[PDB]
Amino acid sequence: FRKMAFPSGKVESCMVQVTCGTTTLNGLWLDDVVYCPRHVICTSEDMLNPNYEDLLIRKSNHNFLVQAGNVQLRVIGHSMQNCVLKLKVDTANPKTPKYKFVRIQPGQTFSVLACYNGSPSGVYQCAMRPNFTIKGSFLNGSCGSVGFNIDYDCVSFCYMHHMELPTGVHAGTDLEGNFYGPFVDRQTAQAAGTDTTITVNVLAWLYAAVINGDRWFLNRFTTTLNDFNLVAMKYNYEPLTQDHVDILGPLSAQTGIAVLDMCASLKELLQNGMNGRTILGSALLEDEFTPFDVVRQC
Amino acid sequence: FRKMAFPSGKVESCMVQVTCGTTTLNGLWLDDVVYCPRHVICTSEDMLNPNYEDLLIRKSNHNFLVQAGNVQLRVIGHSMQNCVLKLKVDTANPKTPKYKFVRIQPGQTFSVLACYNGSPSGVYQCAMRPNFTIKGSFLNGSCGSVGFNIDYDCVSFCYMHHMELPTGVHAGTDLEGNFYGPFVDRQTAQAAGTDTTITVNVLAWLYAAVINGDRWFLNRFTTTLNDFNLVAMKYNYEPLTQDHVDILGPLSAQTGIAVLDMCASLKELLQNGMNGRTILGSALLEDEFTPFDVVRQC
């Protein structure tokens, strides 16, 4: 079992470089529109309290330089939607995939294509944390890199990267420019809230462990939803709902382990630890695999 | 810090499906040649002691079905190079990237594009273990998936997947068809040797931890190389060579921490464990980031 990202080719052909004045970052070119963070129009002076609609009124089309690799795209229009700048260009991207813009929930996973100067640099799998941050690997200029899922030839874009938070985690928007989490695109003392562990994903990963070789944490006992959630609360774990239990249905049937029987296993791990043992090569309880991820793998 | 794969798009465009008889697996389509494991021509009862020279002489071109997406590629010639089959096809791949074939050494990392029936499934980062196996995530029919790097526009193909070993790890060849390690493409009793931890990579990852602001595991001690190796080998670590010490020179200069001072830190980490802490988010010492990988990502 490995953390696996989607093949990124359909998204690589959409990445472009956007330059406004002295600032460069990445854009997403779909049909004849390039999408990028609206803070590309912020200058080092305006970073504390930018007035984005005033900064945008001041800009005109020729203020933006868009490059798809070596070819320059001419900007013929500009507008803002929430925290995303939309640049209308003269040429439709001839490699535009089938795609949707989707907004995901905390606990859901996606692939991130990390880019710099419009050039794809790496791909990795991420999860939206309960506190709405991303534990990404992003350096300066990574803004505009996107997160996505693929469903049989359709790319569902869910994340555009905007900024780094002081604890080293990352904050961004959906592709309609709505932030995930209580964050703003300005220079501020904002910080990630206290995070929690994604319980349904840890259970999915324990099922993944059983499907492979690892069975030492199983036991004869079961628990109740109410009893387990009291322990989840103590250990900073998200509450487990009936809808989570239903989503884990297929894995419960495939193994001989009912969800609340597995909760009995997880309850034990949360207090007594792992007693030196390892689960799928990890000394920690892994929470960035969804139930679907465990089934798409395996 | 994430295990980051290379963007897979250049390789996705080269994956095809190869069928011989009742067996289907993946091939790699570069220019007018499809490369695939020669065991595609093995039959269900050939599997213990096939004579591949005798199996191949009995095939004609039309016994190979090659499919690139929905298009059938016509095989016009075939040839065997060590353990890879080279199928000459009627059409050059119009999306062939700049590429090279490279044989790697243990400790080296690469991205794997897992494919089934010629269609890519996921991408993840991998490493060649000291025992010449791969701890991959491969299912039945993954044979012919390739491992690659892409430093500066050129795809370096370094691994083609052939088989699973009894411990669940994986064996394969370079793109000239020479196996990594002492494995053969036969159904046998073969098993991977005792594996070791890749010491030079653990040290690189500790340097990455310092670069990203974590110093808690450092100590006031140094060590000689020979004393380090005498201790580390008692934890099943690979010996560290003067070559490895030279290789770590740039990370030592960037962080100001002498290589043998980091070795003293590692000795203490092996002695004490983590004591509840993590390093770059891991509760184990990570050994599948090379010194090159750390410089790439940091």
Ligand SMILES: CC(C)(C)c1ccc(N(C(=O)c2c[nH]cn2)[C@@H](C(=O)NC2CCCCC2)c2cccnc2)cc1
């Ligand atoms: C204008 C605004 C909103 C204040 C801003 C400023 C800088 C950036 N950062 C660009 O690297 C960058 C590149 N081009 C434009 N910005 C980085 C970033 O977030 N530092 C934050 C640190 C202080 C508080 C606000 C910004 C960054 C680093 C690593 C990974 N991700 C992003 C993002 C947003």
Ligand SMILES: CC(C)(C)c1ccc(N(C(=O)c2c[nH]cn2)[C@@H](C(=O)NC2CCCCC2)c2cccnc2)cc1
């Ligand atoms: C003919 C030969 C060399 C013995 C062989 C037979 C089967 C396969 N395996 C194919 O899946 C497969 C082969 N051709 C199409 N698919 C699987 C495989 O290695 N089983 C081994 C089981 C023990 C005995 C040797 C083979 C496989 C590969 C990767 C990940 N999980 C399962 C590989 C090689």
